[PDB]
CSV table of C-alpha atoms and ligand atoms in Angstrom, one decimal:
chain,number,residue,atom,x,y,z
O,1,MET,CA,-148.9,-11.6,-37.5
O,2,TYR,CA,-147.1,-14.6,-36.0
O,3,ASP,CA,-144.1,-12.6,-34.6
O,4,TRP,CA,-147.0,-10.6,-32.7
O,5,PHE,CA,-148.2,-14.1,-31.4
O,6,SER,CA,-144.9,-15.1,-30.4
O,7,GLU,CA,-144.3,-11.8,-28.3
O,8,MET,CA,-147.8,-12.1,-26.6
O,9,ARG,CA,-147.0,-16.0,-25.8
O,10,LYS,CA,-144.0,-14.5,-24.1
O,11,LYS,CA,-145.2,-11.7,-22.2
O,12,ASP,CA,-149.3,-11.6,-21.9
O,13,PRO,CA,-150.5,-15.3,-22.8
O,14,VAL,CA,-154.1,-13.9,-21.7
O,15,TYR,CA,-154.5,-10.0,-22.6
O,16,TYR,CA,-157.0,-7.3,-22.5
O,17,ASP,CA,-156.6,-4.3,-24.7
O,18,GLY,CA,-159.4,-2.3,-23.1
O,19,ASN,CA,-161.9,-3.5,-25.5
O,20,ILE,CA,-161.8,-7.4,-25.7
O,21,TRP,CA,-160.0,-10.4,-24.1
O,22,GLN,CA,-157.5,-11.9,-26.4
O,23,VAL,CA,-155.7,-15.5,-25.8
O,24,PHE,CA,-152.4,-16.6,-27.4
O,25,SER,CA,-150.9,-19.6,-25.7
O,26,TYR,CA,-152.0,-23.3,-26.2
O,27,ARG,CA,-152.8,-24.1,-22.5
O,28,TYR,CA,-155.1,-21.3,-22.0
O,29,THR,CA,-156.7,-21.9,-25.8
O,30,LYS,CA,-157.4,-25.2,-25.1
O,31,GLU,CA,-159.1,-24.6,-21.5
O,32,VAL,CA,-161.6,-21.6,-23.0
O,33,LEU,CA,-162.8,-24.1,-25.8
O,34,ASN,CA,-163.0,-27.3,-24.0
O,35,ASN,CA,-164.2,-25.8,-20.7
O,36,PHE,CA,-167.7,-25.1,-22.1
O,37,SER,CA,-169.2,-24.5,-18.6
O,38,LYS,CA,-167.3,-21.4,-17.6
O,39,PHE,CA,-166.7,-20.2,-21.3
O,40,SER,CA,-170.1,-20.3,-23.5
O,41,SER,CA,-170.4,-20.5,-27.1
O,42,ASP,CA,-173.8,-18.9,-27.0
O,43,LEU,CA,-173.2,-14.9,-28.3
O,44,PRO,CA,-178.2,-27.4,-28.1
O,45,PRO,CA,-181.1,-29.9,-29.6
O,46,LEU,CA,-180.3,-28.4,-33.0
O,47,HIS,CA,-176.6,-28.9,-32.3
O,48,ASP,CA,-177.6,-32.4,-31.2
O,49,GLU,CA,-179.4,-32.9,-34.6
O,50,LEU,CA,-176.7,-32.1,-36.2
O,51,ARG,CA,-174.0,-34.3,-34.7
O,52,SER,CA,-176.8,-37.0,-35.0
O,53,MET,CA,-176.8,-36.4,-38.8
O,54,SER,CA,-173.4,-36.0,-38.7
O,55,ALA,CA,-173.1,-39.4,-37.5
O,56,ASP,CA,-175.2,-40.7,-40.4
O,57,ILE,CA,-173.9,-39.1,-43.0
O,58,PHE,CA,-169.9,-38.8,-42.3
O,59,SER,CA,-169.5,-42.1,-40.8
O,60,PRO,CA,-166.3,-43.8,-41.2
O,61,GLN,CA,-168.1,-46.5,-43.8
O,62,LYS,CA,-169.9,-44.0,-45.6
O,63,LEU,CA,-166.7,-41.9,-46.0
O,64,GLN,CA,-165.0,-45.0,-47.2
O,65,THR,CA,-167.5,-45.9,-49.7
O,66,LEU,CA,-167.0,-42.2,-51.1
O,67,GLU,CA,-163.3,-42.5,-51.6
O,68,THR,CA,-163.5,-43.7,-55.1
O,69,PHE,CA,-165.9,-41.3,-56.1
O,70,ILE,CA,-164.2,-38.2,-54.2
O,71,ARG,CA,-160.9,-39.7,-56.5
O,72,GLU,CA,-162.5,-39.5,-59.4
O,73,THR,CA,-164.1,-36.3,-59.2
O,74,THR,CA,-160.6,-34.9,-58.0
O,75,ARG,CA,-159.1,-36.7,-61.1
O,76,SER,CA,-162.0,-35.3,-63.4
O,77,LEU,CA,-161.1,-31.6,-62.0
O,78,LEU,CA,-157.7,-32.0,-62.8
O,79,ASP,CA,-158.1,-32.8,-66.4
O,80,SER,CA,-159.8,-29.2,-67.1
O,81,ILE,CA,-156.6,-27.4,-65.6
O,82,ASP,CA,-154.2,-25.5,-68.0
O,83,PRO,CA,-150.5,-26.9,-67.1
O,84,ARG,CA,-149.2,-23.4,-68.5
O,85,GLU,CA,-151.1,-21.2,-66.4
O,86,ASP,CA,-154.3,-21.8,-64.1
O,87,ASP,CA,-156.3,-21.0,-60.8
O,88,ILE,CA,-155.9,-24.1,-58.3
O,89,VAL,CA,-158.8,-22.4,-56.1
O,90,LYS,CA,-161.2,-22.1,-59.0
O,91,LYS,CA,-160.3,-25.6,-60.7
O,92,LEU,CA,-159.9,-27.5,-57.4
O,93,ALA,CA,-160.0,-26.4,-53.9
O,94,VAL,CA,-163.7,-24.9,-54.3
O,95,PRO,CA,-165.2,-27.3,-56.9
O,96,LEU,CA,-164.1,-30.6,-54.8
O,97,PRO,CA,-165.9,-29.9,-51.8
O,98,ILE,CA,-169.1,-28.4,-53.2
O,99,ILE,CA,-169.2,-31.5,-55.3
O,100,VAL,CA,-169.0,-34.2,-52.7
O,101,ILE,CA,-171.3,-32.5,-50.2
O,102,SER,CA,-173.6,-32.3,-53.3
O,103,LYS,CA,-173.6,-36.0,-53.7
O,104,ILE,CA,-173.8,-36.6,-50.0
O,105,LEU,CA,-176.8,-34.3,-49.6
O,106,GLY,CA,-178.1,-35.3,-53.0
O,107,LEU,CA,-178.1,-32.1,-54.7
O,108,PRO,CA,-178.5,-32.0,-58.4
O,109,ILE,CA,-175.5,-31.9,-60.4
O,110,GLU,CA,-174.8,-30.8,-64.2
O,111,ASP,CA,-177.4,-27.9,-65.4
O,112,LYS,CA,-179.1,-27.2,-61.8
O,113,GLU,CA,-175.6,-27.5,-59.6
O,114,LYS,CA,-174.3,-24.5,-61.6
O,115,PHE,CA,-177.6,-22.8,-60.7
O,116,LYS,CA,-177.8,-23.9,-57.1
O,117,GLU,CA,-174.4,-23.2,-56.3
O,118,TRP,CA,-175.0,-19.8,-57.3
O,119,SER,CA,-178.0,-19.4,-54.9
O,120,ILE,CA,-187.7,-13.2,-50.7
O,121,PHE,CA,-190.7,-15.3,-52.3
O,122,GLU,CA,-188.5,-16.5,-55.3
O,123,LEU,CA,-185.5,-17.4,-53.1
O,124,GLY,CA,-187.9,-19.0,-50.6
O,125,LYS,CA,-189.3,-21.2,-53.3
O,126,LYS,CA,-185.5,-22.3,-54.2
O,127,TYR,CA,-185.0,-22.8,-50.3
O,128,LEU,CA,-187.8,-25.3,-50.0
O,129,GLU,CA,-186.7,-27.0,-53.3
O,130,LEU,CA,-183.0,-27.3,-51.7
O,131,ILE,CA,-184.5,-29.0,-48.8
O,132,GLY,CA,-186.6,-31.2,-50.9
O,133,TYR,CA,-183.6,-32.7,-52.6
O,134,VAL,CA,-182.0,-33.5,-49.1
O,135,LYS,CA,-185.4,-34.7,-48.0
O,136,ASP,CA,-185.6,-37.3,-51.1
O,137,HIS,CA,-182.2,-38.3,-50.5
O,138,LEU,CA,-182.1,-39.0,-46.7
O,139,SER,CA,-181.5,-39.5,-40.3
O,140,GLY,CA,-183.6,-38.1,-37.5
O,141,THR,CA,-184.0,-34.5,-39.0
O,142,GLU,CA,-184.6,-35.7,-42.5
O,143,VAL,CA,-187.5,-38.3,-41.3
O,144,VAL,CA,-189.2,-35.7,-38.8
O,145,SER,CA,-190.3,-33.8,-41.7
O,146,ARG,CA,-191.0,-36.4,-44.0
O,147,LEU,CA,-192.6,-25.6,-39.7
O,148,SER,CA,-189.8,-25.4,-37.2
O,149,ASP,CA,-188.4,-28.9,-37.9
O,150,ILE,CA,-188.4,-27.8,-41.6
O,151,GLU,CA,-186.4,-24.4,-40.7
O,152,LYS,CA,-184.0,-26.5,-38.3
O,153,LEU,CA,-183.2,-28.7,-41.5
O,154,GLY,CA,-182.8,-25.9,-43.8
O,155,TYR,CA,-180.7,-24.5,-41.2
O,156,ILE,CA,-178.4,-27.6,-41.0
O,157,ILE,CA,-178.1,-28.1,-44.8
O,158,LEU,CA,-176.9,-24.8,-45.3
O,159,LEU,CA,-174.1,-25.2,-42.4
O,160,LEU,CA,-173.1,-28.5,-44.2
O,161,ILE,CA,-172.5,-26.7,-47.4
O,162,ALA,CA,-170.9,-23.6,-45.4
O,163,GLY,CA,-168.3,-25.4,-43.7
O,164,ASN,CA,-166.6,-26.7,-47.0
O,165,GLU,CA,-165.2,-23.2,-47.4
O,166,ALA,CA,-162.3,-24.1,-44.9
O,167,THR,CA,-161.8,-27.3,-46.7
O,168,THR,CA,-160.9,-25.7,-49.7
O,169,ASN,CA,-158.9,-23.1,-47.8
O,170,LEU,CA,-156.9,-26.3,-46.5
O,171,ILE,CA,-156.3,-27.6,-50.0
O,172,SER,CA,-155.1,-24.0,-51.0
O,173,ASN,CA,-152.9,-23.4,-47.9
O,174,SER,CA,-151.4,-27.0,-48.2
O,175,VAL,CA,-150.4,-26.3,-51.9
O,176,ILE,CA,-148.9,-23.1,-50.9
O,177,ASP,CA,-146.9,-24.9,-47.9
O,178,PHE,CA,-145.9,-28.1,-49.6
O,179,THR,CA,-144.5,-25.7,-52.7
O,180,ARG,CA,-142.7,-23.1,-50.9
O,181,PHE,CA,-141.0,-25.5,-48.5
O,182,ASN,CA,-140.4,-28.0,-51.3
O,183,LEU,CA,-142.0,-31.0,-50.0
O,184,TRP,CA,-143.9,-32.5,-52.9
O,185,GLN,CA,-141.2,-35.2,-53.7
O,186,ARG,CA,-140.5,-36.0,-50.1
O,187,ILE,CA,-144.3,-36.1,-49.3
O,188,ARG,CA,-144.6,-38.3,-52.1
O,189,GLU,CA,-141.8,-40.8,-51.5
O,190,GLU,CA,-142.4,-41.0,-48.0
O,191,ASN,CA,-146.1,-41.0,-48.0
O,192,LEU,CA,-146.5,-38.1,-45.5
O,193,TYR,CA,-149.8,-37.1,-46.8
O,194,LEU,CA,-151.9,-37.9,-43.7
O,195,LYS,CA,-149.3,-35.9,-41.6
O,196,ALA,CA,-148.6,-33.2,-44.2
O,197,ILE,CA,-152.4,-32.3,-44.1
O,198,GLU,CA,-152.3,-32.2,-40.4
O,199,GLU,CA,-149.4,-29.9,-40.4
O,200,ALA,CA,-150.7,-27.5,-42.9
O,201,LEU,CA,-153.7,-27.7,-40.3
O,202,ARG,CA,-151.4,-26.8,-37.5
O,203,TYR,CA,-149.3,-24.2,-39.5
O,204,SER,CA,-151.9,-22.4,-41.8
O,205,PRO,CA,-155.1,-23.1,-39.9
O,206,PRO,CA,-158.2,-22.2,-42.1
O,207,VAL,CA,-159.9,-20.8,-39.1
O,208,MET,CA,-157.7,-18.3,-37.3
O,209,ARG,CA,-159.6,-17.7,-34.4
O,210,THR,CA,-162.8,-18.2,-32.4
O,211,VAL,CA,-164.6,-16.3,-29.7
O,212,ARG,CA,-166.3,-17.3,-26.4
O,213,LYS,CA,-168.3,-15.5,-23.9
O,214,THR,CA,-167.7,-15.9,-20.1
O,215,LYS,CA,-170.5,-17.6,-18.2
O,216,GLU,CA,-169.2,-16.8,-15.0
O,217,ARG,CA,-166.6,-14.6,-13.2
O,218,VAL,CA,-163.4,-16.9,-13.9
O,219,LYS,CA,-159.5,-16.8,-13.5
O,220,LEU,CA,-157.1,-17.5,-16.2
O,221,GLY,CA,-153.1,-17.5,-16.0
O,222,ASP,CA,-152.4,-14.3,-13.9
O,223,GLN,CA,-155.4,-12.6,-15.1
O,224,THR,CA,-158.9,-12.5,-14.0
O,225,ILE,CA,-162.3,-11.9,-16.2
O,226,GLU,CA,-165.7,-11.0,-15.4
O,227,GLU,CA,-168.8,-12.1,-16.7
O,228,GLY,CA,-170.2,-11.3,-19.6
O,229,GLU,CA,-166.9,-10.7,-21.2
O,230,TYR,CA,-166.1,-11.9,-25.1
O,231,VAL,CA,-162.6,-13.9,-24.9
O,232,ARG,CA,-161.2,-14.0,-28.4
O,233,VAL,CA,-159.1,-17.3,-28.9
O,234,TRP,CA,-156.1,-17.3,-31.2
O,235,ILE,CA,-155.9,-20.7,-32.7
O,236,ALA,CA,-153.3,-20.1,-35.0
O,237,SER,CA,-151.1,-18.6,-32.1
O,238,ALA,CA,-151.7,-21.6,-29.9
O,239,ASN,CA,-150.7,-24.0,-32.9
O,240,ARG,CA,-147.1,-22.4,-32.8
O,241,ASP,CA,-146.8,-22.6,-29.2
O,242,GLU,CA,-143.4,-23.8,-28.4
O,243,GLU,CA,-143.9,-25.8,-24.9
O,244,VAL,CA,-146.4,-27.9,-27.1
O,245,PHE,CA,-145.0,-27.7,-30.2
O,246,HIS,CA,-140.8,-28.0,-30.8
O,247,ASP,CA,-139.7,-25.9,-33.5
O,248,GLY,CA,-143.3,-24.4,-33.9
O,249,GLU,CA,-142.2,-22.1,-36.4
O,250,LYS,CA,-140.9,-24.3,-38.5
O,251,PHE,CA,-142.9,-26.5,-41.1
O,252,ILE,CA,-142.2,-30.3,-40.5
O,253,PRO,CA,-144.5,-32.2,-42.8
O,254,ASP,CA,-143.9,-35.8,-40.6
O,255,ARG,CA,-144.9,-34.1,-37.3
O,256,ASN,CA,-146.3,-36.8,-34.8
O,257,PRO,CA,-148.0,-36.4,-32.8
O,258,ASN,CA,-149.5,-33.0,-34.2
O,259,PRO,CA,-152.2,-31.9,-31.4
O,260,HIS,CA,-153.3,-28.9,-33.1
O,261,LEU,CA,-156.8,-27.1,-32.1
O,262,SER,CA,-157.7,-26.0,-35.9
O,263,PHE,CA,-160.8,-27.9,-35.6
O,264,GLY,CA,-161.6,-25.9,-32.1
O,265,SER,CA,-163.4,-28.0,-29.0
O,266,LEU,CA,-165.2,-33.0,-31.9
O,267,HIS,CA,-165.8,-31.4,-34.9
O,268,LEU,CA,-167.8,-33.2,-36.9
O,269,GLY,CA,-166.9,-32.6,-40.8
O,270,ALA,CA,-163.3,-32.8,-39.7
O,271,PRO,CA,-162.9,-36.5,-40.9
O,272,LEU,CA,-164.6,-35.3,-44.1
O,273,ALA,CA,-162.5,-32.4,-44.8
O,274,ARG,CA,-159.3,-34.7,-44.0
O,275,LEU,CA,-160.3,-37.2,-46.6
O,276,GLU,CA,-161.1,-34.5,-49.1
O,277,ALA,CA,-157.8,-32.7,-48.9
O,278,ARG,CA,-155.9,-35.8,-48.7
O,279,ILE,CA,-157.2,-37.3,-52.0
O,280,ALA,CA,-157.0,-33.8,-53.4
O,281,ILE,CA,-153.3,-33.4,-52.6
O,282,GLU,CA,-152.5,-37.0,-53.7
O,283,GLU,CA,-154.2,-37.1,-57.3
O,284,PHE,CA,-152.7,-33.3,-57.8
O,285,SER,CA,-149.2,-34.7,-56.7
O,286,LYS,CA,-149.4,-37.3,-59.3
O,287,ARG,CA,-150.0,-35.0,-62.2
O,288,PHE,CA,-147.3,-32.3,-61.4
O,289,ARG,CA,-143.7,-33.4,-61.1
O,290,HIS,CA,-143.2,-29.5,-61.0
O,291,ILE,CA,-145.1,-26.5,-59.4
O,292,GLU,CA,-144.3,-22.9,-59.9
O,293,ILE,CA,-146.8,-20.3,-58.1
O,294,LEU,CA,-147.0,-17.2,-60.5
O,295,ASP,CA,-149.4,-14.8,-58.6
O,296,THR,CA,-151.6,-15.0,-55.3
O,297,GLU,CA,-154.6,-13.2,-53.5
O,298,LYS,CA,-155.4,-13.7,-50.0
O,299,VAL,CA,-159.1,-13.8,-48.7
O,300,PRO,CA,-159.6,-10.1,-47.3
O,301,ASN,CA,-160.6,-11.6,-43.7
O,302,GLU,CA,-158.8,-11.4,-40.5
O,303,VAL,CA,-160.7,-14.4,-39.2
O,304,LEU,CA,-160.5,-16.8,-42.2
O,305,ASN,CA,-156.7,-18.1,-43.6
O,306,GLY,CA,-157.3,-19.0,-47.2
O,307,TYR,CA,-156.9,-17.7,-50.9
O,308,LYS,CA,-158.8,-16.0,-53.3
O,309,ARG,CA,-156.5,-16.8,-56.3
O,310,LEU,CA,-153.8,-19.2,-56.5
O,311,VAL,CA,-152.2,-19.2,-60.2
O,312,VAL,CA,-149.8,-21.8,-60.6
O,313,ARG,CA,-147.7,-23.5,-63.4
O,314,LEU,CA,-147.5,-27.0,-63.6
O,315,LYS,CA,-144.7,-29.5,-65.5
F,401,HEM,C1,-160.4,-27.8,-42.9
F,401,HEM,C2,-161.6,-27.7,-42.6
F,401,HEM,C3,-162.5,-27.0,-41.4
F,401,HEM,C4,-161.9,-26.6,-40.2
F,401,HEM,C5,-160.7,-26.1,-40.4
F,401,HEM,C6,-163.1,-26.1,-39.3
F,401,HEM,C7,-162.5,-25.2,-38.3
F,401,HEM,C8,-163.8,-24.9,-37.5
F,401,HEM,C9,-163.6,-24.5,-36.5
F,401,HEM,C10,-162.2,-23.8,-35.7
F,401,HEM,C11,-164.7,-24.0,-35.6
F,401,HEM,C12,-165.1,-23.4,-34.5
F,401,HEM,C13,-165.3,-24.7,-33.4
F,401,HEM,C14,-165.0,-24.1,-32.1
F,401,HEM,O1,-165.3,-22.9,-31.8
F,401,HEM,O2,-164.6,-24.7,-31.1
F,401,HEM,C15,-165.7,-25.0,-36.7
F,401,HEM,C16,-167.4,-24.8,-36.3
F,401,HEM,C17,-168.0,-25.4,-37.0
F,401,HEM,N1,-167.7,-26.4,-38.2
F,401,HEM,FE1,-166.0,-26.6,-39.2
F,401,HEM,N2,-164.2,-26.5,-40.0
F,401,HEM,C18,-163.6,-27.3,-41.3
F,401,HEM,C19,-164.8,-28.0,-42.2
F,401,HEM,C20,-166.2,-28.0,-41.8
F,401,HEM,C21,-167.1,-28.9,-42.7
F,401,HEM,C22,-166.6,-29.9,-44.0
F,401,HEM,C23,-167.9,-28.5,-41.9
F,401,HEM,C24,-169.4,-29.4,-42.6
F,401,HEM,C25,-169.8,-29.9,-43.5
F,401,HEM,C26,-168.2,-27.7,-41.1
F,401,HEM,C27,-169.3,-27.5,-40.0
F,401,HEM,C28,-168.9,-26.6,-38.7
F,401,HEM,C29,-169.8,-26.3,-38.0
F,401,HEM,C30,-171.3,-27.1,-38.3
F,401,HEM,C31,-169.5,-25.6,-36.8
F,401,HEM,C32,-170.2,-25.3,-35.8
F,401,HEM,C33,-170.6,-26.4,-34.7
F,401,HEM,C34,-169.6,-27.1,-34.4
F,401,HEM,O3,-168.4,-26.5,-34.0
F,401,HEM,O4,-169.9,-28.5,-34.6
F,401,HEM,N3,-166.9,-27.4,-40.9
F,401,HEM,N4,-165.1,-25.2,-37.6
């Protein structure tokens, strides 16, 4: 996949295959995402309400308060791992983000957490019960419904939960990358957790690509695209651009600065994702002097970069 990106960056940065436009290089990838006037995400107050809530619940002071909870949750999750043979995705990568968002949203843990995680009129009742939890715990969108406002809140709740899949993938991708390149001891001894997670974001981005729609007739590079044309933007490719990232195919855990476009356009749950991953790796690296990878299964999706299974043995 990345060899294809290399050649396309070299020979056709902006490319039309007959069906859809595709962008591979960093400069043009960045331009498409940031130039929101020319390139649309459609095909805003709901977005602004999301941004307003993200400020409230993902503030630096709120996340700094949660650090100890996240650590103990992580620590508790690792205790249920079988050192001889066990799945990292099932035991750590999937649970931690859901437990942490459940603490933030105020979703019920324990017996209801098993049932609520798994989840028309019976479903609708649970959907309203779900909203009721967040309503009770909390922000503009919570207070405004304390029917369109109710659906708006329900929609944002689903988003805030759903986004944690990429965080799950980042943890898994990090474990794979640090193990294959044998970086654990180095990251541990040199305190590269922060940068190594960012390098894992650049190198193994949970979201491989995104789409934009041309608002007007625009020109990018040598090419010129018309209105109503969908522009595929390969984030994974942009992250390996040689001009921006020297030795772009190399995994450098102390790479700094690392202006990857893995989060896209500011992304709301990025500080949260980073924190969860940082603490996940830190606590995990403490329990394992040695990590052997036995079996892996990728997620069957061209858009997402992650693992359905990651079976490991620990010392
Ligand atoms: C490693 C973790 C994550 C990665 C790599 C990631 C990546 C992305 C990317 C690439 C986009 C598309 C943005 C664009 O097209 O410009 C996106 C959108 C979004 N992500 Fe994430 N994401 C992560 C975690 C989360 C989390 C934890 C949440 C919520 C709790 C979240 C909520 C969203 C939402 C709501 C959108 C659409 C609206 C927006 O861009 O603000 N994501 N994400």
